[PDB]
C-alpha cells in the first residue's frame, strides 16, 4: 500500500525517511520513520523495529538516539512507528502500552499490538527492500515493554529483542495498572512480560540506568522479569548502568551495543 | 477443577473435567486420559460442531495412547454458555466453531480466544494438575482442529515435539469456511488472517524440522468442496524442506470412522518424538 513521504535526510550513507499511510488497524493516518542503510541500495535488509515511550513521536528516536552509524555499518533497516493514533489526553501516563484495547472508546482505534506485529510489517515488506524472514524488535520504557511482549507472545517471529528501561511487570506498577484499567478494563497478564516469559517455549539484552527516576519510583520492576527468566533458563543479559537516567542521553550511550546484538541474530 | 466423569479404558482412566477459563471467560469442559503410566502430553483438537465428547467416544485412540504411555487432552472447540448475539445461529461460526484464533473483533474479543486457550491456559492448567512433563508436548487434530494443530505448532517453534492432522483446513485464507470465520473474528485486515494460515505460516517457520503426518480421505466431501486445500500446504512444506507424509486414503470420508482407522498410526508417530 501507498505511502506519502514526509521527509528524507541522508545520514551515515543511508537515508532517514518519514512516511504517512492509511492504517487499517488504527482507522487513521499513521506516521512511521524508516532508515534505509547503504545495503538497501542494492539488496534486501533484515529489519529492526523500535518502539518509543511516553511523549514521543517518531522524531525523538530518529533525531536523538544516534543509532544510524551502527545501523549503517551492519546494514539494518530500522522502522520507528509513532506511539499512538491520537495525541495524549494528559496521575497516569494516558498511554495505551501497545495493547489491542478492549474498552470503548479506545476499542475502536487503539489497536497498537496488531499494528506493530501484523499491519506495519506487511506494509514495510511490500514497500521497502526488507527481508520478510528476518525481523527483530527493541524499544524504550513503555516501548521496552512493547518490544518484550511482542517477542514473547510470538515465539520465533523476532530473531532477537532488547530494551532500554522497560516496564517489566506492568500488572503490578501504577503506570501499568492505570493504563490497563483504561484500555483493557485478568486480560492484563497477556500483556505482561514477567507473566509471558514464564510459559515461553530467546536472546534478550536489557540496559537500565540506576539513577532512572522511574526505576526508583517502582514503575519498571526489572528484578521480577529477570527472576522469571532465570527460572525458565531463558538467557538474559541485564545491565544496571551506574548513574544513567531514563533519557535519550542514556539510550545514545548504549545503542551501538543493541544494534550489534540484533545484527548478530539477524545474521547481518 | 471439577471432575465430571471417570471411566476406565485400556487400564487408564478417561476423565472429563470442568473449569472456569480465564482466557475464554466461561465454564469449559475438557477430556483427559491418564494412561496406566500416569508422562508426555498429546493434545487433540476437534473440528466444527464437536464438543469434548466426540473424539474420546468415537476415535478408539485409547489402546495406543495406553501402550505408549501418553496423557491425551481433548478440549472443547469454542467458549460455551456465553449467549453472545450471533454465536448460536450457524454450525460453521461461533459455538463449536472457534477456529483456534484469538478474535480481534467485537463481539468475539472477550470469549473467542481459543488460540490462547489451547497454547497457554490449557497447558498451564494441565501441567499444574496432572502428572505431565511440561517439556514434552505434541498436538494433532481433525479439520478445523487439523488447522488448529498445524498453526499451533508453526506459530510456536520449539513448543511441540511433533504434529499431525486428519483432513486439515490447510489454507483457510482461500476457502469459504476460513473466509467467513476470519472475516467475523479478525475483520478485513488479512495480515491477521495469514498469521493463522498453515500454508502461509510454514513458509516463514524458523524452528527445527517437524515431521508432519497428514491423512486425508479421498471421498471427503469437504475436500471436494475445496475447504481443505492440502496440496497448497504440501507444496509450501516442500519448499521450506519441512518433511511431510501426506496420505490420500481411497474411499474414506471426513467422519470419525476415517479417523478411527488411522489413529494408531498417529499415536505411534507422536510417541516416536515424545518418548
Ligand atoms: Ca530519570
Ligand atoms: Ca511415556
Ligand atoms: Ca476463538
Ligand atoms: Mg511488560
Domains of chain B, residue spans: 1-275
Resolution in Å equals 1.5
Cβ neighbours of residue B42 closer than 8 Å, sequence gap 6 or more: B65, B70, B71, B72, B73, B137, B138, B139, B140, B267, B270, B274
Q: Phi and psi at residue B35, in whole multiples of 5°?
A: -70, 165
- At the topology level, CATH places domain B1-275 in Rossmann fold (3.40.50)
Q: Where are the beta strands (DSSP E) in B81-179?
A: 137-142, 163-166
User: In Å, how far is A62's CA from the nearest CA of chain B?
Assistant: 27
Contact B189 A155 (CB under 8 A): no
Q: Three-state SS string across B42-109, please?
A: EEEECCCCCCCCHHHHHCCCHHHHHHCCCEEEEECCCCCCCCCCCCCCCCCCECCECCCCECCCCCCC
In terms of DSSP bridges, do strands B71-75 and B41-45 run parallel, antiparallel, or are they unpaired? parallel
Cβ neighbours of residue A117 closer than 8 Å, sequence gap 6 or more: A150, A153, A154, A157
Q: Nearest ligand to the C-alpha of residue A193? A: 4
- Is B220 catalytic? The answer is yes
C-alpha dist (Å) from residue B26 to A56, A98, B78, B81, B113 = 39, 26, 10, 7, 11
Q: Which of B104, B155, B207 sits opposite A100 (nearest CB)?
A: B104
Whether residue B127 lies within 8 A of chain A, CB to CB, comes out as no
Taking the centre of ligand 1 as the mean of its atom positions, its distance from the CA of residue A251, in whole angstroms, is 12
Residue holding cell 491520537?
A: A86
CA angle, B172 as apex, B235 and B29 as ends, to 5°? 120
Whether residue A119 lies within 8 A of chain B, CB to CB, comes out as yes
Count of pairs with CB atoms under 8 A, one residue in A, one in B:
46
In terms of DSSP bridges, do strands A204-209 and B12-21 run parallel, antiparallel, or are they unpaired? unpaired
Radius of gyration for chain B, computed over Cα atoms and rounded to the nearest angstrom? 17
Q: Rounded distance, CA B218 to CA B24, Å?
A: 36
Helix (H/G/I), strand (E/B), else coil: B7: strand
User: Cis omega (within 30 of 0) on the bond before B107?
Assistant: yes
- At the topology level, CATH places domain A1-268 in Rossmann fold (3.40.50)
Q: Phi and psi at residue A18, in whole multiples of 5°?
A: -130, 135
Helix (H/G/I), strand (E/B), else coil: A18: strand
Residue pair B201/B173 in contact by the 8 Å Cβ criterion: no
Q: Which of B23, B157, B191 sits opposite A119 (nearest CB)?
A: B191
Q: Rounded distance, CA B159 to CA B136, Å?
A: 8
Q: How many CB atoms lie within 10 A of CB B88?
A: 13
C-alpha dist (Å) from residue A134 to A36, B134, B201 = 15, 29, 14
Q: Which three cell numbers stand for residue B48?
A: 466444527
Please report which helix (H) or strand (E) contains residue A229, including its range: helix A222-231
Contact B22 A186 (CB under 8 A): yes
Taking the centre of ligand 2 as the mean of its atom positions, its distance from the CA of residue B266, in whole angstroms, is 15
Q: Which of B68, B93, B241, B266 is nearest to B167 (CA)?
A: B266
In terms of DSSP bridges, do strands B12-21 and B2-9 run parallel, antiparallel, or are they unpaired? antiparallel
> Which residue of chain B comes nearest to A152, CA vs CA?
B156
Residue pair B264/B166 in contact by the 8 Å Cβ criterion: no
Q: Which three cell numbers stand for residue A64?
A: 536523538
Amino acid at each position: 500500500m501507498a505511502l506519502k513521504q514526509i521527509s528524507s535526510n541522508k545520514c551515515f550513507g543511508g537515508l532517514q525517511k518519514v512516511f504517512e499511510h492509511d492504517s487499517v488497524e488504527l482507522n487513521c493516518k499513521m506516521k512511521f520513520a524508516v532508515y534505509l542503510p547503504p545495503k538497501a541500495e542494492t539488496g534486501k535488509c533484515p529489519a529492526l523495529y523500535w518502539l518509543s515511550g511516553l511523549t514521543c513521536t517518531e522524531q525523538n528516536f530518529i533525531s536523538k538516539s544516534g543509532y544510524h552509524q551502527s545501523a549503517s555499518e551492519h546494514g539494518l533497516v530500522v522502522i520507528a512507528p509513532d506511539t499512538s493514533p491520537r495525541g495524549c489526553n494528559i496521575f497516569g501516563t494516558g498511554a495505551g502500552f501497545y495493547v489491542d484495547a478492549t474498552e470503548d472508546p479506545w476499542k475502536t482505534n487503539y489497536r497498537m499490538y496488531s499494528y506493530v506485529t501484523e499491519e506495519l510489517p506487511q506494509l514495510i515488506n511490500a514497500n521497502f527492500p526488507v527481508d520478510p524472514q528476518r525481523m527483530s524488535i527493541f524499544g524504550h520504557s513503555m516501548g521496552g515493554h512493547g518490544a518484550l511482549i511482542c517477542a514473547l507472545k510470538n515465539p520465533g517471529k523476532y530473531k532477537s529483542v532488547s530494551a532500554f528501561a522497560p516496564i517489566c511487570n506492568p500488572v503490578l506498577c501504577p503506570w501499568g495498572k492505570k493504563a490497563f484499567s483504561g484500555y483493557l478494563g485478568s486480560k492484563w497478564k497477556a500483556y505482561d512480560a514477567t507473566h509471558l516469559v514464564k510459559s515461553y517455549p530467546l536472546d534478550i539484552l536489557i540496559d537500565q540506568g540506576k539513577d532512572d527516576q522511574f526505576l526508583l519510583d517502582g514503575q519498571l520492576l526489572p528484578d521480577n522479569f529477570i527472576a522469571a527468566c532465570t527460572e525458565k533458563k531463558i538467557p538474559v543479559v541485564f545491565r544496571l548502568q551506574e548513574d544513567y537516567d531514563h533519557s535519550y542521553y542514556f539510550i545514545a550511550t548504549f545503542i551501538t551495543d543493541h544494534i550489534r546484538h540484533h545484527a548478530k541474530y539477524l545474521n547481518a
